[PDB]
Every structure is written in structure tokens, then in C-alpha cells.
Amino acid sequence: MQNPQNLIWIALEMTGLDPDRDVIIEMATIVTDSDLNTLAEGPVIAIHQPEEILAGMDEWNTRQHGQSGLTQRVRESTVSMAEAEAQTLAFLEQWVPKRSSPICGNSICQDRRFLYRHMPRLEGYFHYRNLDVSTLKELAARWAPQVRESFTHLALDDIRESIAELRHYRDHFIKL
Amino acid sequence: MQNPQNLIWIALEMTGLDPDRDVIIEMATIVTDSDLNTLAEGPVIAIHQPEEILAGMDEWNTRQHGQSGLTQRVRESTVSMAEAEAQTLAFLEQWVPKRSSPICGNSICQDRRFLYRHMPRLEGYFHYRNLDVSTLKELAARWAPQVRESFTHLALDDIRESIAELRHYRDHFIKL
């Protein structure tokens, strides 16, 4: 089951853009193999936060997490940050050994920074490498401008879209 | 002269790897066009730091920056963190518009962390995306190992090698 070549894909939602001042309010994970085939989907967790944190979000986050239903899910959740971290680690441990996988997704530097502050045990579970699908997005936009046009509010859909985007580049942008 | 397609490459030296404990002590930039041709090399700035900050460095950093001469350059420098940020912004503004270029280089999530904390105006001048060559290296390691295998003491050589590493992957790992 564990395989050091498997990939951990993660997507977070936050109350804001500052990893040190804002907090995580949703997380989800998916594990693929090294050739991007989905092995298992992880839990989608809304992380409880006090009401003043929800009220303090800026106008974009207030509207977006409001109409997605996440704000209400956060208020109703009884899962703390630490419980969400432990639940996610308990899933990932079945599929990927410690320190093996890069953190995989779109602009996952932002996600790693939030994990380092708020879920450092989970952050430390990753290899130090980042696998950033948006690096390839930027290169394709400049070098193959319509490989980019040949190619999501639910968490697992967002991650599936990131895996699909990398599959698209492996097939039409990368020379294997 | 400004072109929203131009890429900003950056390299930093720090007293250590933790932005809460450590500070930037050297910075350098290079601007390329979208096809990795040098347009201009920016200033290489040693950033002054008081002696207790220089004393507060651990063993590996105290030795590595002492031996390279950076510590002495920092002790002597009359350029503050804010002035170095302004000097670098004055250069980049001649070539790239605001919020257009991602941060380009290797291990540039760590750079973004330091810029966010210590040079927020320069950090905000970049597009929020990262163009990390190590994403390509990780993919080549899994999917085309011979390309990774078939491929920096001073700041401008250090950046130029990162540009040469991307160029290598464009020529042997990207199909165009």
C-alpha cells in the first residue's frame, strides 16, 4: 500500500492570504501514483473557527466562502485544526511513507506556508520539494500558448482538476 | 521597454532559513524575456545588518558567510533593507510591469517567504505565481531521468545557472 513514489495532492481554503495571520478553514487530499492515476481520495474537512474570525474576513473571502457554503460548514464543524491534521495524516499514512512525496497542486507554496504555520506535523510529512502545476501553466502560456487553451468550487473537484491539468501537460507539453 | 511577458529572476542570501528569526543580507536580480534571453542584470546588493544580528547566526551560516566575504560586505554596507528593496524596484520597473512576472528561480517559495516578511513592496510587485525550475527537475526525475542527469558561488552566476537549468529543460524536456 505505502509506496515512496506515490504523490500527495492537497488543496486548502483559508480566511485570507497571510499564512501567519489567517487560518485554514478547509482541506482535502488525493493520492495518485507517479503516473497521475488516482489511488484514493482523502477526507474533505471543514475546520471550525470562531465567529469573529469568520466576521473578520475581507470582502472577497466573505462573499466566496459565504456562497460556497464553507462559512456555514466552518461554523457547524466540530473538527479543530489539530483534529483535521490528524485525520488527514491517518489517511495519507496508508498510501505514502513519510518524507517521500512533494506537495502537489496549483500554487502550493501558499498551501505549504499555511501548513507549516498551522499543521506542522502534516507539513513535515512531505518531501521538501514542491510540485507546482502552475509553473507549467506559466511556461505553457508563454511557450505553447494553445496547449493552454486545449485544457470547480468543491474541494475534490479542485484537486481532480489540478491532476487533470498536469496530465494535460505531460501529454501535450512535455516531450517524454 | 516594459513588457508584461518579461521574467524577473531573483537570488537571496539570508542569515538563516527562518524569516521570523533571520534577515536578508544579499539580493540580486536578472530580467530575461519570455524566451530566457538576458535583457539586463540588476544590482547585487549587500544589505547592512547590525553586529548583534550578525552574531545571532548559527554555526553553518556564521562560517559560510564569513568565508565568502559576505559578512564583511554586510558589516560595511551602507544600504538598508528598505533602500535595497527600493534600488531593486527601481531597476525592475524599467523592464517589467507590476504583478506580471512570477518569481523565477530555484527554491523560490523560501525567497517569497523572506520577501513577504522583509520586502513586502517587492514581494507584491511579483505575480503571485512561482516559476520554480525544481518542479521541472522533479518531473524529469520521474518521467525522463536522463534529462535531469544530463544537466554558482556568486549571485549573478547563481541566477544564470538557474536560467540555464530551465533552458536545458525547455530544449530537452518540453516539446515545441
Swiss-Prot record, chains A, B:
List of catalytic residues: 128
UniProt keyword annotations, A-Z: Cytoplasm, Exonuclease, Hydrolase, Nuclease
Keyword DNA-binding carried by entry: no
Gene Ontology molecular functions: 3'-5'-RNA exonuclease activity; nucleic acid binding
Domain Exonuclease: 7-166
Subcellular location: Cytoplasm
Membrane-spanning parts: none
InterPro entries: Exonuclease_RNaseT/DNA_pol3, Oligoribonuclease, RNaseH-like_sf, RNaseH_sf
Pfam families assigned: RNase_T (PF00929)
GO CC annotation: cytoplasm
Primary role: 3'-to-5' exoribonuclease specific for small oligoribonucleotides.
UniProt name for this protein: Oligoribonuclease
